[PDB]
Scaffold this active site. Structure first.
Site, PDB file in Angstrom:
ATOM      1  N   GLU A  11       0.764  -1.252   0.000  1.00 29.23           N
ATOM      2  CA  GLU A  11       0.000   0.000   0.000  1.00 29.23           C
ATOM      3  C   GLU A  11       0.802   1.314   0.000  1.00 29.23           C
ATOM      4  OE1 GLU A  11      -2.622  -1.881   3.146  1.00 29.23           O
ATOM      5  OE2 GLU A  11      -4.191  -0.949   1.963  1.00 29.23           O
ATOM      6  N   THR A  16      -0.307   2.993  -8.149  1.00 29.84           N
ATOM      7  CA  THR A  16      -0.879   4.291  -8.468  1.00 29.84           C
ATOM      8  C   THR A  16       0.093   5.109  -9.352  1.00 29.84           C
ATOM      9  OG1 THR A  16      -2.130   4.100  -6.439  1.00 29.84           O
ATOM     10  CG2 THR A  16      -2.018   6.296  -7.479  1.00 29.84           C
ATOM     11  N   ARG A 146      -8.438   0.983  -4.875  1.00 31.20           N
ATOM     12  CA  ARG A 146      -7.531   0.112  -4.165  1.00 31.20           C
ATOM     13  C   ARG A 146      -7.799  -1.277  -4.706  1.00 31.20           C
ATOM     14  NH1 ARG A 146      -3.027  -1.810  -2.691  1.00 31.20           N
ATOM     15  NH2 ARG A 146      -3.149  -3.495  -1.153  1.00 31.20           N
ATOM     16  N   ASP A 168       6.031  -3.954 -11.725  1.00 37.29           N
ATOM     17  CA  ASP A 168       5.347  -3.704 -10.474  1.00 37.29           C
ATOM     18  C   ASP A 168       5.015  -5.042  -9.801  1.00 37.29           C
ATOM     19  OD1 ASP A 168       3.863  -2.258  -8.646  1.00 37.29           O
ATOM     20  OD2 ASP A 168       2.059  -2.407  -9.898  1.00 37.29           O
ATOM     21  N   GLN A 172       3.203  -7.084   0.276  1.00 38.31           N
ATOM     22  CA  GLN A 172       2.899  -7.819   1.495  1.00 38.31           C
ATOM     23  C   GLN A 172       3.979  -8.871   1.643  1.00 38.31           C
ATOM     24  OE1 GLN A 172       0.293  -7.101  -0.730  1.00 38.31           O
ATOM     25  NE2 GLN A 172      -0.654  -5.565   0.627  1.00 38.31           N
TER      26      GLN A 172
END
Ligand SMILES: Nc1nc2c(ncn2[C@@H]2O[C@H](COP(=O)(O)OP(=O)(O)O)[C@@H](O)[C@H]2O)c(=O)[nH]1
Ligand code: ALF
Ligand SMILES: [Mg+2]
Length: 313
Positions: A11, A16, A146, A168, A172
């Site tokens: 995150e 983005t 998201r 990309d 996690q």
């Protein structure tokens, strides 16, 4: 042919930054592409209001107005359509009354105590628009979505006569095992860090501070001899959320010895130094830092433009 790799914890804003390339170098999202995110917007919005109502029970927070109790019941009865890309003026009302309730707001303002999407307020504050009949998400609505990245996403684009191949991955812990598949021929790494993470904990672990985790990651990548010849670019992301958060939440939560003020300029340079300090070859290796707001196109445009000249040198 330049190969860029976007790394960082979960995150941090990696995906983005990728979405911006389309808007900046191509022509943004077409109507058919914008309509594809319609269900994600609704899914994101319904999940955010549920996360707050879910926390109110855990934290034992009452509703401001007793009548919200029926609305909360109606929410679950109606939540199913939203996921399918449908918003009813009935469901919209329910969510709107809930969002304006003082008890819901009080819970909203204690969000570091649980897990809530960065974009919950963005969407929840714009309910009238996004619930309209015949609504098609805007460019910003898309950027605000998201969607968890698992695996490897490869994107291509031309900029300044160079053919870009942007990579990309997921940040996690369980995803990090897949990072080594992208390590070949990397022209430059763009390490993303969420400045507003300083007072949060890992979704994957409530005992671990989110910023400490990034530091561990950056230290590892930055000092990896394999990348001795790769340009290391550091994006100190979410500068807009950090700016609003630094005013009310203490940075001593993350850095106990911070003796500066609850101000953006001073707290931002401090975090920059914390991260730049992890470089073990300061005389032989350069770190290219930029403070960013991944959702702001103009900000990302000026920053990406500067980053490419560095790559062009
Ligand atoms: N307001 C704000 N939110 C951001 C920014 N960067 C990303 N987001 C939001 O944060 C969420 C997570 O970002 P994402 O790109 O999916 O991160 P990844 O997990 O690292 O790929 C998404 O809903 C984004 O819209 C930023 O600078 N400002
Ligand atoms: F949480 Al991310 F891409 F690392 F979804
Ligand atoms: Mg992602």
């Amino acid at each position: 042919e330049v190969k860029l790799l976007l790394l960082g914890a979960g995150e941090s804003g990696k995906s983005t930054i990728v979405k911006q390339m389309k808007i900046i170098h191509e022509a943004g999202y077409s109507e058919e592409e914008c309509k594809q995110y319609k269900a994600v917007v609704y899914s994101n919005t319904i999940q955010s209001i549920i996360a707050i109502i879910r926390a109110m029970g855990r934290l034992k927070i009452d509703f401001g107005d007793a009548a919200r109790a029926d609305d909360a019941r109606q929410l679950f009865v109606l939540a199913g359509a939203a996921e399918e890309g449908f918003m009813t003026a009935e469901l919209a009302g329910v969510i709107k009354r809930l969002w304006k309730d003082s008890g819901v707001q009080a819970c909203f303002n204690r969000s570091r105590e649980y897990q809530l999407n960065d974009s919950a307020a963005y969407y929840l504050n714009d309910l009238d628009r996004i619930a309209q009949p015949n609504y098609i998400p805007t460019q910003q609505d898309v950027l605000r979505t998201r969607v968890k990245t698992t695996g490897i996403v490869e994107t291509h684009f031309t900029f300044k006569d160079l053919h870009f191949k942007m990579f990309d991955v997921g940040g996690q812990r369980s995803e990090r095992k897949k990072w080594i598949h992208c390590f070949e021929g990397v022209t430059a790494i763009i390490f993303c860090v969420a400045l507003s993470d300083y007072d949060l904990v890992l979704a994957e672990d409530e005992e671990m501070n989110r910023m400490h985790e990034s530091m561990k990651l950056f230290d590892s990548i930055c000092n990896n001899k394999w990348f001795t010849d790769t340009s290391i670019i550091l994006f100190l992301n979410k500068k807009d959320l950090f700016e609003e958060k630094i005013k009310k939440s203490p940075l001593t939560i993350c850095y106990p010895e911070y003796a500066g003020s609850n101000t953006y300029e001073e707290a931002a340079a401090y975090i920059q130094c914390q991260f730049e300090d992890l470089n073990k070859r300061k005389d032989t290796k350069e770190i290219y830092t930029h403070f960013t707001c991944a959702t702001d196109t103009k900000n990302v445009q000026f920053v990406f433009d500067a980053v490419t000249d560095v790559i062009i040198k």
